[PDB]
Write a protein that binds this ligand. Structure first.
Ligand SMILES: *[C@@H]1O[C@H](CO)[C@@H](O)[C@H](O)[C@H]1NC(C)=O
Lengths: 49, 49
């Protein structure tokens, strides 16, 4: 279970090749579901599955 | 031999299968997005409630 800056959910965190913009924190797919999230500390994209 | 070229040139010759696939995908996506709705609830997130 993960709580990224108030975003609650459950999944498996893994390194993501895609890079977010400097100002973009979260990431959602077409289905409007959180697909990846940027770590507020390491500033690294962590794919959520 | 002409039908192969006709199909290659045309793009809507596969209307039935593509339409069925698109309809199924749209229905599934609508079902997925409907979770965001609160249906009169204060929030649409179980943890928030
Ligand atoms: C937080 O601190 C660590 C080391 O203390 C550093 O590596 C990291 O970049 C910092 N993150 C931010 C967002 O400043």
């Amino acid at each position: 279970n993960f709580n990224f800056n108030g975003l609650t959910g459950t999944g498996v965190l893994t390194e993501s090749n895609k890079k977010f913009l400097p100002f973009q924190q979260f990431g959602r797919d077409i289905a409007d579901t959180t697909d990846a999230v940027r770590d507020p500390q390491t500033l690294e994209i962590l794919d959520i599955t | 031999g002409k039908i192969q070229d006709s199909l290659s040139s045309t793009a809507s010759a596969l209307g039935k299968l593509q339409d069925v696939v698109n309809q199924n995908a749209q229905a599934l996506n609508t079902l997925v997005k409907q979770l965001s709705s609160n249906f009169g609830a204060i929030s649409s997130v179980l943890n928030d409630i």
